[PDB]
Structures are given as C-alpha cells and as structure tokens.
Amino acid sequence: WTGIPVSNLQRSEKEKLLHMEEYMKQHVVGQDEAIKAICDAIRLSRTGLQNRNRPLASFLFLGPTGCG
Amino acid sequence: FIDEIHTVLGAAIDAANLLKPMLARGELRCIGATTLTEYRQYVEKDPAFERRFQLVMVEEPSV
Amino acid sequence: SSMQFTDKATETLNAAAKYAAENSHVQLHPSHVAVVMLDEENSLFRSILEKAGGDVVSIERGFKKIMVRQPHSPELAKLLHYAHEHMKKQRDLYIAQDHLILALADLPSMAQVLKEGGVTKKSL
Amino acid sequence: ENAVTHVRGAYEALSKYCIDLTELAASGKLDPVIGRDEIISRVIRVLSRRTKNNPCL
Amino acid sequence: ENAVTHVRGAYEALSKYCIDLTELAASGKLDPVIGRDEIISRVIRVLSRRTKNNPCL
Amino acid sequence: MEKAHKDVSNLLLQILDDGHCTDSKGRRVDFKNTIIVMTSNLTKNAVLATARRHFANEFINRIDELIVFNRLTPSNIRKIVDVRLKEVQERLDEKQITLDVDDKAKDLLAQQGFDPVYGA
Ligand SMILES: Nc1ncnc2c1ncn2[C@@H]1O[C@H](COP(=O)(O)OP(=O)(O)O)[C@@H](O)[C@H]1O
After folding, report:
1. Is the CB of D24 inside 8 Å of chain B's CB atoms?
2. From the list F35, F79, F120, which residue is nearest A55 (CB)?
3. Which residues of C13-31 are buried (b: 16+ CB within 10 A; e: fewer)?
4. Chains A and E touch (3+ CB pairs under 8 A)
5. How many Å lie between the centroid of ligand 1 and the Cα of residue F86?
6. Where are the domains of chain C?
7. DSSP 8-class letter at B32
8. What distance, in Å, lies between the first and last C-alpha atoms of chain B?
9. How far is residue D15's CA from residue F91's CA, in Å, rounded to a whole number?
10. Which fold has domain C7-124?
C-alpha cells in the first residue's frame, strides 16, 4: 500500500539506533560534528534516562543555510 | 528591482524585519535604489544593514 | 449567471408588472414589455425601429394579439437568457434597455412579429 | 452552460501586483540601455559573493 | 375599474411629505418678519441669476 | 521559527513540559512520540549566544541539543557533487546509458552551486 519494502521494517529496535549515525553520513558529508549530536538526544530518551513527560528530542538548527 | 527602497525599509510600513533573514541566508535577494541623502538615514545608521548592502555609485552622464 | 441591470432597465420591468393590472392579468408575460415601450413618447424602443426601417403600427398589433390569447411566467426566464448574450457581444458590462430588445428576435414565438413588421435580425 | 456565463460575463501574484521586466524585453517593448557597461557587469559580481551580496543603487 | 384604483390610492408627493409654507402665510397663520428688510429682499436678488442661483443662509 | 510574536512561543513551551496540548474541541494529544525540530539563522560559540537573547529565558535553556551548523568545508564539497549525480545515473542504467563526467565539469558544479553564506 505504501512503498517501503519489508526489509526496512523487520529490523530490531536496539540495532537501528546504533547504526543511525552512520546512515545519515552517506548523503550529508561535511557535518561530522552535527550528525553525531543528533543521536545523542534520541538514544537517551528511549533508554529510560529521560523523563516521559518530555517529547522525543528538541533541536534548533542555526547558522547559515545550504549545509543540509 | 525595488524602486525607491526607503519606503519598504521603514517609511508603507516597516518591512525590513521580514526581509533580513532572506537577504542574509540568500533565499531572496533584492536590488536597492535610493537617494544618497536617504541612504545615510536608513542604511549607514544601522550596523545590520551596512554589512549586507554594498555602496554602488551611479555615474551621471555629461556631454 | 451575473444578470445585473441598470437604472433605466429596472424602470421598465417594474412598470410592466403594474401595467398588466389595468388590462386584467394575473401573470407577467414577456409580451407586455414591448407594449409599455410603445406607449411612451420618444422612447428607446421607438428610436431603434425608425433607423432599421420598421412600421411601429404593425409591430404593436402583433404583440397585442398574443396578450389576448393569454389566460411570473416561465417564458420570462428564457428571455433573460438570450438577452445576457448580447451584453458580451457589444463589448459592454451592464445590461441596458437595448440588450433586452435584441432578445426578442431569438424566441420562436416572438420573432414572427418582427418579420411581418419589417425588422431584419441582421439589420437590427 | 450557466457556469461559464457567470465567470465570463507560481506566477499569479507576480503578474498582478508586480510587472515582469523580462516580458517587455523579450517582446520588443523595452527601451535599450547603451552606456552603462561599467555598472551592469558590477551587479553580477556582487551577487556572486558572500559579504555584501546585495547591490544598492 | 382596475385603472381608477391605482390613480387615487394637484400633487400627491407635495401634500403628503412636504408642508406648504405659502399656505399658512395666505391664511394669516404665519408670524410676520420685521427688521429683515436687507436679508429677505437679498434672496430675491440671487435667484434671478445664471450661475450660483442657490443662496445658502 | 523566528517570524512570529509571543503567542505561539508560550504555547509550544507546555509541550516540552507536560507532553500534551489543550485542544479547542477538547482533546489531549500526547506529544511523546513527535519530535520537535526548528530552523532559524540567529566561531560557533558566538552564533548560539544570539538566539538566547531573542527568545524567552525559560525556553532557550530547555532545549536538548543546540546544534549549530558551521560553514561548509571546501574539502568536503567535492564529495557532495559526486553522490548527487549518482541518482541521475540510476535512471539511465535501465536504458544502457553511461553518463560520464570529466574532472573539469566537477569543479564548476562545486565552486558555483555551493557557497557558505548564500545557500544551496
Ligand atoms: N548534500 C546535499 N546534496 C544535494 N543537495 C543538498 C544537500 N544538502 C542540501 N541540499 C539542498 O539544499 C536545499 C536547502 O533547502 P532549505 O534552505 O533547507 O529549504 P527551507 O529553507 O525551505 O527549509 C535543499 O532543497 C536540498 O535539495
């Protein structure tokens, strides 16, 4: 009905967050210190280290545009 | 091409707040055209406007 | 459809409804419009027939016979449809009195009077 | 039939509120400019920079 | 019979919406004016003109 | 997220605390599974200090990570124009069409289409 293959849904939850920082660096090359900081707030709120009353992650993209 | 830019930058009303992120990030560029007398009282008096607008002098024909 | 009227057009349709009260009528038939315009001295409908070469006496007799055979009429809704087409033909925006006159030559039950009086559709 | 009668009898806001200057030049309705060769070539160089990329006449 | 009714329902709009001032002056029911000989006669000398024939007090 | 007043700024603050907003019809949509990302434009130490003075005091500190994108490194621009042209090659592999680009055309598509303060 949608289009995403089945192989992208049968992956384990504990294995997708480990290789998440390596998949985003395939197309976006240049921000090696910004992509790593993205998984720092997602992997912390899913392991019980963050209060459940707060959402997933809160980001604020600043600086010049055109980077990605 | 913005004819007489001193009106849109703070006369109609002040519309320079919505055009600052566009001119800085390069999303929407514009070409200014005003008088040297009005260019000092609206561009040189603001540090944020001088760093983005470059002084372009127009030569006057003679004979 | 946007069928706007002018100041002069409203003075004719409103007077045609009250004109049928004296002639003993209970409906607004489109044939009563041409009768009111012919009863006014120096009107717009009379000046048009003089330039196109038409006898105003024979035309008045044609619309008078239709009124006798009569007992808002549904025929009035069809007359306003053909009159709106003449508004866009003359490169105009409003609907004056001459626009309602040109619609009389489009109806099959109203174009017979114009033929016997000497009114050509191409010349009108 | 009544729908097309009431109506008759991207680039939408740019053609109604603004005037496209390239349309008059591509149709021969714009007057040419001869003598400003030292200014047109400078405006192009300003737009291809980082600091002060907005020319002001 | 249907024609004499609409006629009934001189002048009609002048006797149902306006008060004739000359009617009260002819029957003596209007107070005279003493002292305005230079103002009342001035209005007469204005209505007999070609331009600006509408005096405003 | 900078071209607004203080009406929408105070409404988004309760989402980062309670986790749900008050709907006008009478619902409590839990925002526990909805990530909140923003985009603005207010070396990297002096950039984040500007946005802290524009918004409220009790809002810029509750942000998880203040990721500030720096300038584009010139050594990484060449690696960007190479992975984008691969998508065009994928649409021509079914028709047996080999799209080859020399080393001269790759330099023009990098120093012109990319700029630190101009945008892609
Ligand atoms: N690594 C990249 N390769 C190719 N194109 C890119 C890359 N990074 C960014 N872009 C392009 O730059 C553009 C940036 O758009 P952006 O300014 O984010 O739009 P908006 O201001 O509406 O969010 C995107 O449309 C994207 O196509």
Report:
1. no
2. F35
3. beebeebbeeeebeebbbb
4. no
5. 17
6. 7-124
7. B
8. 28
9. 36
10. Double Clp-N motif (1.10.1780)
